[PDB]
Coordinates of C-alpha atoms and ligand atoms in Angstrom, one line a residue:
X1176 CA 30.8 -43.1 21.3
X1177 CA 33.2 -40.0 20.8
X1178 CA 32.1 -38.9 17.2
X1179 CA 28.6 -37.9 18.5
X1180 CA 29.8 -36.3 21.9
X1181 CA 33.4 -35.1 21.0
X1182 CA 32.1 -32.0 19.0
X1183 CA 30.5 -30.6 22.2
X1184 CA 33.7 -31.9 24.1
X1185 CA 36.2 -30.0 21.8
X1186 CA 34.2 -26.7 22.1
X1187 CA 34.6 -26.6 25.9
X1188 CA 38.2 -27.9 25.8
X1189 CA 38.9 -24.7 23.8
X1190 CA 37.0 -22.2 25.9
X1191 CA 38.9 -23.5 28.9
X1192 CA 42.2 -24.2 27.2
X1193 CA 44.4 -22.5 29.9
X1194 CA 42.9 -25.1 32.2
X1195 CA 42.6 -28.6 30.6
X1196 CA 44.1 -31.8 32.2
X1197 CA 43.2 -35.5 32.4
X1198 CA 43.0 -36.0 36.2
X1199 CA 44.6 -39.3 37.0
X1200 CA 42.6 -39.6 40.3
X1201 CA 39.0 -39.2 38.8
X1202 CA 36.4 -40.8 41.1
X1203 CA 34.1 -42.1 38.3
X1204 CA 33.8 -45.7 37.0
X1205 CA 30.3 -45.9 35.2
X1206 CA 30.6 -42.2 33.8
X1207 CA 33.0 -41.9 31.0
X1208 CA 35.6 -39.3 31.9
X1209 CA 37.3 -36.7 29.6
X1210 CA 39.0 -33.8 31.6
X1211 CA 38.8 -30.9 34.0
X1212 CA 39.1 -27.0 34.2
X1213 CA 39.3 -24.5 37.1
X1214 CA 36.1 -22.9 38.9
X1215 CA 35.4 -21.8 42.4
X1216 CA 31.7 -21.2 43.9
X1217 CA 28.5 -23.0 44.9
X1218 CA 21.6 -21.8 47.5
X1219 CA 20.0 -23.1 50.8
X1220 CA 16.7 -23.2 52.6
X1221 CA 15.7 -19.8 54.2
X1222 CA 12.9 -19.6 56.9
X1223 CA 9.5 -17.8 56.1
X1224 CA 8.9 -15.6 59.3
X1225 CA 5.3 -14.7 58.4
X1226 CA 4.4 -18.5 58.5
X1227 CA 6.7 -19.2 61.5
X1228 CA 5.5 -16.4 63.8
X1229 CA 1.9 -17.7 63.1
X1230 CA 2.8 -21.3 63.9
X1231 CA 4.6 -21.0 67.3
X1232 CA 3.6 -24.3 68.9
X1233 CA 5.7 -25.9 66.2
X1234 CA 8.9 -24.0 67.2
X1235 CA 9.5 -27.0 69.6
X1236 CA 8.6 -30.0 67.3
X1237 CA 12.0 -31.3 65.9
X1238 CA 10.3 -33.0 62.8
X1239 CA 9.3 -29.4 61.8
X1240 CA 12.4 -27.5 63.0
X1241 CA 15.0 -29.9 61.4
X1242 CA 13.4 -29.6 57.9
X1243 CA 14.9 -26.1 57.6
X1244 CA 18.6 -27.0 58.5
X1245 CA 21.3 -28.5 56.2
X1246 CA 23.1 -40.8 46.8
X1247 CA 25.6 -39.3 44.3
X1248 CA 26.9 -43.0 44.7
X1249 CA 23.7 -44.2 43.0
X1250 CA 24.0 -41.9 39.8
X1251 CA 27.4 -43.8 39.6
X1252 CA 25.8 -47.4 39.4
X1253 CA 25.4 -49.4 36.0
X1254 CA 22.2 -51.4 35.0
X1255 CA 22.5 -54.8 33.2
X1256 CA 21.1 -55.1 29.6
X1257 CA 17.8 -57.2 29.8
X1258 CA 17.4 -60.8 28.6
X1259 CA 16.1 -61.3 24.9
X1260 CA 12.6 -62.3 26.4
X1261 CA 12.3 -59.0 28.4
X1262 CA 13.6 -56.7 25.5
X1263 CA 10.8 -58.2 23.2
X1264 CA 8.0 -57.6 25.8
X1265 CA 9.1 -54.0 26.3
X1266 CA 9.3 -53.3 22.5
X1267 CA 5.8 -54.9 21.8
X1268 CA 4.1 -52.9 24.8
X1269 CA 5.9 -49.6 23.7
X1270 CA 4.5 -50.0 20.1
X1271 CA 0.8 -50.7 21.4
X1272 CA 1.1 -48.0 24.0
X1273 CA 2.3 -45.2 21.8
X1274 CA -0.3 -46.1 19.2
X1275 CA -3.0 -46.0 22.0
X1276 CA -1.7 -42.6 23.2
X1277 CA -1.9 -41.4 19.6
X1278 CA -5.2 -42.9 18.5
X1279 CA -6.9 -39.4 19.3
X1280 CA -3.6 -37.1 19.4
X1281 CA -1.5 -35.4 16.7
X1282 CA 2.3 -35.0 17.4
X1283 CA 3.3 -31.3 16.6
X1284 CA 6.2 -28.9 17.2
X1285 CA 5.8 -26.4 20.0
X1286 CA 6.6 -22.8 19.0
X1287 CA 9.0 -19.8 20.0
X1288 CA 5.6 -17.9 20.9
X1289 CA 4.5 -20.7 23.4
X1290 CA 8.2 -20.8 24.8
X1291 CA 8.3 -17.1 25.5
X1292 CA 4.8 -17.2 27.3
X1293 CA 6.1 -19.9 29.5
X1294 CA 9.2 -17.8 30.7
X1295 CA 7.1 -14.7 31.1
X1296 CA 5.1 -16.5 33.9
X1297 CA 7.7 -18.5 36.1
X1298 CA 7.5 -22.2 35.1
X1299 CA 10.8 -23.8 36.3
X1300 CA 12.3 -24.7 32.8
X1301 CA 15.8 -25.4 34.4
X1302 CA 18.1 -22.7 32.7
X1303 CA 21.5 -21.2 33.6
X1304 CA 22.3 -17.5 34.6
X1305 CA 26.5 -16.4 30.9
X1306 CA 25.9 -13.9 28.0
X1307 CA 22.4 -12.4 29.3
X1308 CA 21.1 -12.5 33.0
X1309 CA 17.5 -14.0 33.5
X1310 CA 15.3 -16.2 31.3
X1311 CA 12.9 -13.2 30.5
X1312 CA 15.8 -11.0 28.9
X1313 CA 17.4 -13.6 26.5
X1314 CA 13.9 -14.4 24.9
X1315 CA 13.4 -10.7 23.9
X1316 CA 16.8 -10.5 22.2
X1317 CA 17.2 -11.6 18.4
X1318 CA 20.9 -12.8 18.8
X1319 CA 19.9 -15.7 21.1
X1320 CA 17.5 -17.1 18.4
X1321 CA 20.6 -16.8 15.8
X1322 CA 22.5 -19.2 18.3
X1323 CA 19.4 -21.3 18.8
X1324 CA 19.0 -21.5 14.9
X1325 CA 22.6 -22.4 14.3
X1326 CA 22.2 -25.5 16.7
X1327 CA 18.8 -26.1 15.2
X1328 CA 20.3 -26.6 11.6
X1329 CA 23.1 -28.6 13.2
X1330 CA 20.5 -30.9 14.7
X1331 CA 18.8 -31.3 11.2
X1332 CA 22.3 -32.8 10.0
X1333 CA 22.6 -35.2 13.1
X1334 CA 25.4 -33.3 14.9
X1335 CA 25.3 -31.3 18.4
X1336 CA 27.5 -28.4 19.9
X1337 CA 26.0 -26.4 23.0
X1338 CA 23.7 -29.0 24.4
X1339 CA 25.6 -30.1 27.6
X1340 CA 24.0 -31.1 31.0
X1341 CA 24.9 -29.5 34.5
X1342 CA 24.5 -31.9 37.4
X1343 CA 23.7 -30.2 40.8
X1344 CA 17.5 -39.2 46.1
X1345 CA 17.3 -36.1 43.9
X1346 CA 19.7 -35.0 40.9
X1347 CA 18.9 -31.8 39.0
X1348 CA 20.3 -31.6 35.5
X1349 CA 20.2 -27.8 34.4
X1350 CA 20.8 -27.1 30.6
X1351 CA 21.4 -23.7 29.0
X1352 CA 18.1 -21.9 27.8
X1353 CA 18.5 -22.7 24.0
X1354 CA 18.8 -26.6 24.2
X1355 CA 15.7 -26.2 26.6
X1356 CA 13.8 -24.5 23.7
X1357 CA 14.8 -27.3 21.2
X1358 CA 13.9 -30.1 23.8
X1359 CA 10.5 -28.2 24.2
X1360 CA 10.0 -27.6 20.6
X1361 CA 10.2 -31.4 19.7
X1362 CA 8.8 -33.0 22.7
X1363 CA 6.8 -30.3 24.6
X1364 CA 3.6 -31.6 22.9
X1365 CA 3.5 -34.6 25.4
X1366 CA 2.9 -32.2 28.2
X1367 CA 1.2 -29.3 26.3
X1368 CA -1.5 -31.5 24.6
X1369 CA -1.9 -33.7 27.6
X1370 CA -0.7 -37.2 26.2
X1371 CA -1.0 -38.6 29.8
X1372 CA -4.3 -37.1 30.9
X1373 CA -6.5 -39.8 32.4
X1374 CA -9.2 -39.3 29.6
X1375 CA -6.3 -40.1 27.0
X1376 CA -3.9 -42.6 28.8
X1377 CA -6.3 -44.3 31.1
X1378 CA -3.5 -45.0 33.7
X1379 CA -2.1 -41.3 33.8
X1380 CA -3.2 -38.3 36.1
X1381 CA -1.3 -35.3 34.4
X1382 CA -3.4 -32.3 35.1
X1383 CA -5.6 -34.1 37.7
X1384 CA -4.8 -32.1 41.0
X1385 CA -4.7 -33.3 44.6
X1386 CA -8.5 -32.9 45.0
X1387 CA -9.2 -35.6 42.3
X1388 CA -6.2 -38.2 43.0
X1389 CA -8.3 -39.4 46.1
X1390 CA -11.4 -40.0 44.0
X1391 CA -9.4 -41.8 41.2
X1392 CA -7.9 -44.3 43.7
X1393 CA -11.5 -44.9 45.1
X1394 CA -12.7 -45.6 41.4
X1395 CA -9.7 -47.9 40.9
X1396 CA -10.7 -49.8 44.3
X1397 CA -14.1 -50.4 42.7
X1398 CA -12.7 -52.9 40.1
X1399 CA -13.0 -56.6 41.0
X1400 CA -9.4 -57.7 41.8
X1401 CA -6.6 -58.2 44.5
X1402 CA -4.9 -55.8 46.8
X1403 CA -3.8 -52.3 45.6
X1404 CA 0.1 -52.5 45.2
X1405 CA 2.2 -49.3 45.4
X1406 CA 5.7 -50.4 45.0
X1407 CA 8.2 -47.5 45.0
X1408 CA 11.2 -48.1 42.6
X1409 CA 14.8 -47.4 44.1
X1410 CA 16.2 -44.3 42.1
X1411 CA 13.9 -44.7 38.9
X1412 CA 15.9 -42.0 36.9
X1413 CA 19.0 -44.1 37.5
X1414 CA 17.4 -47.4 36.4
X1415 CA 16.3 -46.1 32.9
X1416 CA 18.1 -48.5 30.5
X1417 CA 19.2 -47.8 26.9
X1418 CA 16.3 -50.1 25.7
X1419 CA 13.9 -47.9 27.7
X1420 CA 15.4 -44.6 25.9
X1421 CA 14.9 -46.5 22.5
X1422 CA 11.2 -47.5 23.3
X1423 CA 10.5 -44.0 24.2
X1424 CA 12.0 -42.7 20.9
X1425 CA 9.3 -45.0 19.0
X1426 CA 7.1 -41.8 19.5
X1427 CA 8.9 -40.5 16.4
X1428 CA 7.3 -43.2 14.2
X1429 CA 4.2 -41.1 14.7
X1430 CA 5.8 -37.7 13.3
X1431 CA 6.8 -36.3 10.0
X1432 CA 8.9 -33.6 8.2
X1433 CA 11.0 -31.0 10.2
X1434 CA 9.4 -32.6 13.4
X1435 CA 10.2 -36.3 13.0
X1436 CA 14.0 -35.3 12.4
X1437 CA 14.1 -32.7 15.4
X1438 CA 12.5 -35.2 17.7
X1439 CA 14.9 -38.0 16.4
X1440 CA 17.8 -35.5 17.1
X1441 CA 16.9 -34.7 20.7
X1442 CA 16.6 -38.6 21.4
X1443 CA 19.7 -39.6 19.4
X1444 CA 22.0 -36.7 20.6
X1445 CA 20.9 -35.5 24.2
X1446 CA 19.0 -38.6 25.6
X1447 CA 20.7 -41.7 24.2
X1448 CA 24.2 -39.9 24.3
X1449 CA 25.0 -37.4 27.1
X1450 CA 27.6 -34.7 28.1
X1451 CA 27.6 -33.3 31.7
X1452 CA 29.5 -30.8 34.0
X1453 CA 29.9 -31.6 37.6
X1454 CA 31.8 -29.7 40.6
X1455 CA 34.5 -31.3 42.7
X1456 CA 36.3 -29.7 45.8
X1457 CA 39.9 -31.3 45.2
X1458 CA 37.5 -26.9 43.0
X1459 CA 37.1 -28.1 39.3
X1460 CA 34.6 -29.0 36.7
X1461 CA 34.6 -32.7 35.3
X1462 CA 33.3 -33.3 31.8
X1463 CA 31.7 -36.8 31.7
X1464 CA 29.6 -38.8 29.0
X1465 CA 27.2 -41.8 29.5
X1466 CA 24.8 -43.5 27.0
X1467 CA 21.8 -44.3 29.4
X1468 CA 19.8 -43.0 32.6
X1469 CA 17.4 -40.0 32.8
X1470 CA 18.7 -36.5 32.3
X1471 CA 16.1 -34.3 30.3
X1472 CA 13.7 -31.5 31.0
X1473 CA 12.0 -31.9 34.5
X1474 CA 8.6 -31.9 32.4
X1475 CA 9.5 -34.3 29.5
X1476 CA 11.1 -36.5 32.2
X1477 CA 7.7 -36.7 33.9
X1478 CA 5.9 -37.7 30.6
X1479 CA 8.5 -40.4 29.6
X1480 CA 8.7 -41.7 33.1
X1481 CA 4.9 -42.1 33.1
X1482 CA 5.1 -43.9 29.7
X1483 CA 7.9 -46.4 30.6
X1484 CA 6.3 -47.1 34.2
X1485 CA 2.9 -47.7 32.4
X1486 CA 4.8 -50.2 30.2
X1487 CA 6.6 -52.0 33.0
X1488 CA 3.4 -52.4 35.0
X1489 CA 1.3 -53.8 32.0
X1490 CA 4.3 -56.3 31.6
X1491 CA 4.3 -57.1 35.3
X1492 CA 0.6 -57.5 35.3
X1493 CA 1.2 -59.9 32.2
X1494 CA 3.6 -62.1 34.3
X1495 CA 1.0 -62.3 37.1
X1496 CA -1.8 -63.2 34.5
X1497 CA 0.6 -65.9 33.2
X1498 CA 0.6 -64.3 29.6
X1499 CA 4.3 -65.4 29.3
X1500 CA 6.3 -68.2 30.9
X1501 CA 9.9 -66.8 31.0
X1502 CA 11.9 -63.6 30.2
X1503 CA 15.0 -65.7 28.9
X1504 CA 13.3 -65.8 25.3
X1505 CA 9.7 -65.5 24.0
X1506 CA 8.3 -68.2 21.8
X1507 CA 6.7 -67.0 18.5
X1508 CA 3.4 -68.4 19.8
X1509 CA 3.9 -66.4 23.0
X1510 CA 4.3 -63.0 21.1
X1511 CA 0.9 -63.8 19.5
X1512 CA -0.6 -64.1 23.0
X1513 CA 1.2 -61.1 24.5
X1514 CA 0.0 -59.2 21.3
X1515 CA -3.6 -60.4 21.7
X1516 CA -3.6 -59.7 25.5
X1517 CA -2.8 -56.0 24.8
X1518 CA -5.6 -55.9 22.1
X1519 CA -8.1 -57.9 24.0
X1520 CA -7.7 -56.3 27.6
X1521 CA -4.8 -53.7 27.6
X1522 CA -7.1 -50.7 28.0
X1523 CA -8.9 -52.3 30.9
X1524 CA -5.6 -53.2 32.6
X1525 CA -4.4 -49.4 32.2
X1526 CA -7.7 -48.5 33.9
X1527 CA -6.5 -50.6 37.1
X1528 CA -3.5 -48.1 37.5
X1529 CA -2.9 -44.6 38.7
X1530 CA 0.6 -43.6 37.4
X1531 CA 2.4 -40.2 38.0
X1532 CA 6.1 -40.4 36.8
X1533 CA 8.0 -43.1 38.9
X1534 CA 4.8 -43.3 41.1
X1535 CA 2.2 -46.0 40.7
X1536 CA -0.7 -47.9 42.3
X1537 CA -1.8 -51.1 40.6
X1538 CA -5.1 -52.9 41.4
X1539 CA -4.3 -56.1 39.4
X1540 CA -6.7 -59.0 38.4
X1541 CA -5.5 -61.0 41.5
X1542 CA -2.7 -61.3 44.0
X1543 CA -0.3 -63.5 41.7
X1544 CA 1.1 -59.9 40.7
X1545 CA 2.5 -59.8 44.3
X1546 CA 5.2 -62.3 43.4
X1547 CA 5.5 -61.8 39.5
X1548 CA 9.0 -60.1 39.9
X1549 CA 11.3 -61.6 37.0
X1550 CA 10.4 -59.0 34.4
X1551 CA 10.3 -56.2 36.8
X1552 CA 13.7 -57.0 38.4
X1553 CA 15.2 -57.6 34.9
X1554 CA 13.8 -54.3 33.4
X1555 CA 16.0 -52.8 36.2
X1556 CA 12.8 -51.3 38.0
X1557 CA 13.9 -52.9 41.4
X1558 CA 11.7 -52.2 44.3
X1559 CA 12.8 -49.9 47.3
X1560 CA 12.9 -51.3 51.0
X1561 CA 12.3 -55.0 50.4
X1562 CA 14.6 -57.9 49.2
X1563 CA 14.9 -58.4 45.5
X1564 CA 13.0 -61.7 45.6
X1565 CA 10.6 -61.1 48.6
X1566 CA 6.9 -60.8 47.4
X1567 CA 5.1 -57.3 47.5
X1568 CA 3.1 -56.3 50.7
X1569 CA -0.1 -54.8 49.3
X1570 CA -2.9 -52.6 50.6
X1571 CA -6.4 -53.9 51.5
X1572 CA -8.0 -50.4 51.8
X1573 CA -7.7 -47.4 49.3
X1574 CA -7.7 -44.9 52.2
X1575 CA -4.4 -46.5 53.2
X1576 CA -2.5 -46.5 49.8
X1577 CA 0.3 -44.1 49.4
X1578 CA 0.2 -41.9 46.2
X1579 CA 2.1 -38.6 45.4
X1580 CA 3.3 -38.2 49.1
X1581 CA -0.4 -38.4 50.2
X1582 CA -3.2 -40.7 51.6
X1583 CA -6.9 -40.2 51.0
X1584 CA -9.7 -39.9 53.6
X1585 CA -13.5 -40.5 53.1
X1586 CA -15.4 -37.7 54.9
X1587 CA -19.0 -37.4 55.4
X1588 CA -20.4 -33.8 55.3
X1589 CA -23.2 -32.9 57.8
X1590 CA -25.6 -33.1 54.8
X1591 CA -24.6 -36.7 53.9
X1592 CA -22.5 -35.7 50.7
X1593 CA -19.1 -37.4 50.5
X1594 CA -15.7 -35.7 50.2
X1595 CA -12.5 -37.7 49.4
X1596 CA -9.7 -35.4 50.8
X1597 CA -6.0 -35.5 50.4
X1598 CA -3.8 -35.7 53.6
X1599 CA -0.4 -36.3 55.0
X1600 CA 1.6 -35.9 58.2
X1601 CA 0.9 -32.3 59.6
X1602 CA 4.7 -31.8 60.5
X1603 CA 5.5 -32.3 56.7
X1604 CA 2.9 -29.6 55.7
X1605 CA 3.8 -27.0 58.3
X1606 CA 7.5 -27.7 57.8
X1607 CA 7.3 -26.8 54.0
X1608 CA 5.3 -23.6 54.6
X1609 CA 8.0 -22.4 57.0
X1610 CA 10.6 -22.6 54.2
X1611 CA 11.4 -20.2 51.2
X1612 CA 13.9 -20.9 48.4
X1613 CA 16.3 -18.0 47.4
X1614 CA 17.9 -14.6 48.3
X1615 CA 16.5 -11.1 48.2
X1616 CA 12.9 -11.7 49.5
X1617 CA 10.9 -8.6 50.8
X1618 CA 8.5 -8.8 53.9
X1619 CA 5.7 -8.4 51.2
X1620 CA 6.9 -11.3 49.0
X1621 CA 7.5 -13.4 52.2
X1622 CA 3.9 -12.5 53.2
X1623 CA 2.5 -13.4 49.8
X1624 CA 4.2 -16.9 49.8
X1625 CA 2.8 -17.4 53.3
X1626 CA -0.6 -16.6 51.8
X1627 CA 0.0 -19.1 48.8
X1628 CA 0.4 -21.8 51.5
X1629 CA -2.5 -20.8 53.8
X1630 CA -4.8 -20.7 50.7
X1631 CA -3.6 -24.2 49.6
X1632 CA -4.2 -25.5 53.3
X1633 CA -7.8 -24.0 53.1
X1634 CA -8.6 -25.6 49.7
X1635 CA -6.9 -29.0 50.2
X1636 CA -6.3 -29.5 54.0
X1637 CA -9.4 -27.6 55.4
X1638 CA -10.3 -30.8 57.2
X1639 CA -7.2 -30.6 59.5
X1640 CA -8.0 -28.3 62.6
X1641 CA -4.6 -26.8 63.0
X1642 CA -4.4 -25.9 59.3
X1643 CA -7.8 -24.3 58.8
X1644 CA -6.8 -22.1 61.9
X1645 CA -3.2 -21.4 60.8
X1646 CA -4.7 -20.6 57.3
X1647 CA -7.3 -18.0 58.6
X1648 CA -4.5 -16.4 61.0
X1649 CA -2.0 -16.1 58.1
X1650 CA -4.8 -14.7 55.7
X1651 CA -5.8 -12.3 58.4
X1652 CA -2.2 -11.1 59.2
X1653 CA -1.5 -10.4 55.5
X1654 CA -3.2 -7.5 53.6
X1655 CA -6.5 -8.8 52.0
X1656 CA -5.7 -7.5 48.6
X1657 CA -2.0 -8.8 48.2
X1658 CA -1.6 -11.6 45.8
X1659 CA -0.2 -15.1 46.4
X1660 CA 3.3 -15.8 44.9
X1661 CA 5.6 -18.9 44.2
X1662 CA 9.0 -19.1 42.4
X1663 CA 8.4 -22.7 41.3
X1664 CA 4.8 -23.3 40.2
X1665 CA -0.6 -29.9 39.0
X1666 CA -3.6 -27.7 38.9
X1667 CA -3.1 -24.9 41.4
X1668 CA -6.5 -23.2 42.1
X1669 CA -5.4 -21.6 45.4
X1670 CA -3.3 -19.0 43.5
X1671 CA -6.0 -16.1 43.3
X1672 CA -7.4 -13.3 45.3
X1673 CA -11.1 -14.5 45.0
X1674 CA -13.1 -15.6 48.2
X1675 CA -11.6 -18.8 49.3
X1676 CA -15.2 -20.0 50.1
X1677 CA -16.2 -19.4 46.5
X1678 CA -13.0 -21.3 45.2
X1679 CA -14.0 -24.2 47.5
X1680 CA -17.6 -24.4 46.2
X1681 CA -16.4 -24.4 42.6
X1682 CA -13.7 -27.1 43.2
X1683 CA -15.3 -29.4 45.7
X1684 CA -19.0 -29.0 44.6
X1685 CA -19.6 -27.2 41.2
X1686 CA -16.8 -28.9 39.2
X1687 CA -16.4 -32.1 41.2
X1688 CA -17.8 -35.0 38.8
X1689 CA -18.2 -37.4 41.9
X1690 CA -20.7 -34.9 43.6
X1691 CA -24.2 -35.2 42.0
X1692 CA -26.1 -32.7 44.3
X1693 CA -24.6 -29.2 43.4
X1694 CA -26.1 -27.3 46.5
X1695 CA -23.3 -24.7 47.1
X1696 CA -22.1 -24.5 50.8
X1697 CA -22.9 -21.1 52.4
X1698 CA -20.3 -20.9 55.2
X1699 CA -17.1 -22.7 56.5
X1700 CA -19.0 -24.4 59.4
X1701 CA -21.0 -26.6 56.9
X1702 CA -17.5 -27.8 55.8
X1703 CA -16.3 -30.8 58.0
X1704 CA -13.1 -31.9 59.7
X1705 CA -11.7 -35.4 60.1
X1706 CA -12.6 -37.1 63.3
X1707 CA -10.7 -35.7 66.4
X1708 CA -8.8 -38.9 66.9
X1709 CA -8.1 -39.1 63.1
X1710 CA -6.6 -35.6 63.1
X1711 CA -4.3 -36.6 66.1
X1712 CA -3.0 -39.8 64.2
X1713 CA -2.2 -37.5 61.1
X1714 CA -0.2 -35.2 63.4
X1715 CA -2.5 -32.6 65.0
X1716 CA -1.5 -30.9 68.3
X1717 CA -5.3 -30.7 69.3
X1718 CA -5.3 -31.6 73.1
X1719 CA -1.9 -30.0 74.0
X1720 CA -1.6 -27.1 76.2
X1721 CA 0.7 -25.2 73.8
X1722 CA -1.8 -25.7 70.8
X1723 CA -4.7 -24.3 72.9
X1724 CA -2.7 -21.3 74.2
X1725 CA -2.0 -20.6 70.6
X1726 CA -5.7 -20.9 69.5
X1727 CA -6.9 -18.8 72.7
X1728 CA -4.4 -15.9 71.9
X1729 CA -4.4 -16.2 68.0
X1730 CA -5.4 -12.5 67.4
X1731 CA -2.2 -11.3 69.4
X1732 CA 0.0 -13.4 67.0
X1733 CA -2.0 -11.9 64.0
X1734 CA -1.5 -8.4 65.3
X1735 CA 2.3 -9.1 65.8
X1736 CA 2.8 -9.6 62.0
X1737 CA 0.3 -6.8 61.0
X1738 CA 2.6 -4.4 63.1
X1739 CA 5.7 -5.5 61.3
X1740 CA 4.1 -5.3 57.8
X1741 CA 2.6 -1.9 58.5
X1742 CA -0.8 0.3 58.3
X1743 CA -2.3 -1.8 55.3
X1744 CA -5.9 -3.1 54.8
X1745 CA -6.4 -6.3 56.7
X1746 CA -9.6 -8.6 57.0
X1747 CA -10.4 -10.8 60.2
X1748 CA -11.0 -14.4 58.8
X1749 CA -11.4 -15.9 62.3
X1750 CA -15.1 -15.3 62.7
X1751 CA -15.6 -18.0 60.0
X1752 CA -14.7 -20.5 62.8
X1753 CA -17.5 -21.6 65.0
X1754 CA -15.4 -20.9 68.3
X1755 CA -14.2 -17.3 67.4
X1756 CA -17.9 -16.5 66.6
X1757 CA -19.1 -14.9 69.9
Ligands
LIG2043 CL1 1.6 -53.2 15.0 C1 0.6 -52.6 16.1 C2 1.1 -51.6 16.9 C3 0.2 -51.1 17.9 C4 -1.1 -51.6 18.1 C5 -1.6 -52.6 17.2 N1 -2.7 -53.4 17.2 C6 -2.6 -54.2 16.1 N2 -1.4 -54.1 15.5 C7 -0.7 -53.1 16.2
LIG2044 ZN1 22.3 -29.8 20.5
LIG2045 ZN1 -4.7 -38.3 57.2

């Protein structure tokens, strides 16, 4: 308790001395309270006019229009320590898993050089804006690294000072840029050297990208077994138990020297002990500790979520296969079987799973999995939108399975070659493209974000009619040579000024390991759509008056935007479409 966290606590206490008080009406139970000090201040979702002007029919679809307008009583719930039988299975699996992830990997500290190169190309590392201003500035200053160094040597002694979380079904936990570095130095390797690639982790999909996920599920489907299950966990970050945080820490048994200690520090002092600063209108800043839950770097979170989820799902598989009988206690002769299962078939069982953070698809050996819930529910990994003890509804077709907000279509090119293409409700896709995050955007920046979306649609969602059209319109309405932008950057191959037909060929034909014939496609008309009825089901306006008026007169919308932007150099991309071709 207060020995490990109190130092950090005292330091803030003293900086806001003229304000301190123990508020006798503090709304926490599960969060350990400490006090309050005076503040007064807060970003909301602005509309992108380049994208909106070029998608007029949607100005009247509420599912689209509402997306641009607008539980903290779930971060304040407490998870129950698992049984002795559960806690044993988790610890055995974590060991075997970590060793497997490390069989062909070397843990290693990430560097200041690598950290600087991250910041000098916009990758949301979650910092605060105060002694400097932006991320860029502070990295180029030497004083910073003297503060970073103090804390680094502090960590080598097992004490912490400036590493405090800032809260703001999502809960974002911004840290000050220094503690970010040190979190990155120790654990960045997990991300940077791809510990959860599919090659390496067998269940994982890090670095895979939306044009592979579909092919991966279809490969999974090919295994002999039961239904594909895809259970969403209810508030996964909040259901991370202290035993989870401890099994994750077992990565350090793979380390040495300076590293092993620094890794051990981050886990000990920031992950398995926490300190956080939250707003409250009655306006103040409450300083609260808790020992468990997730509250890390958005990246490390991903890797450790994937790891613990991989673990849960091997175990739930075990309960289905009847490897263990009860979670109340493991017999010694049950350990020998649990251990031998992992060694005999564990790798094969990882290959029946596609896991991306809190998100999974399991094709288990049979449908006993569906009702194997004791370990799952006892680990705290309790299922969303279904009763605790009601068995899992599982999917019979891989083209129906939800995965990373998407579903995946099989789609036969006019030449017999097979595309597996990502997809989701068109109102969702068009709604996101109509939205920008932040203040002080120029028409040029707004235009270049519009372009980023258009090029994604062209690469990923070319098979949806409204999107190939809106995409050609946007790319026509925005100067040909202006570069796509994005303030919060998976593989993102649409971020480029290259010919989008050339990028398509490289991605879907040339580099696509599931495509044997490498015959490049010569024009967009060779590139097919979903069925017209399939397009409507996935939220197309094809067949409506308004949609046809829009298509008819598209060149008039394109010019409207061109007129606002100015006398630049523009290309007409609509003659790539059969119907705008004479
Ligand atoms: Cl002790 C231990 C950890 C991970 C994997 C293993 N295989 C055999 N023994 C093992
Ligand atoms: Zn620290
Ligand atoms: Zn679809």
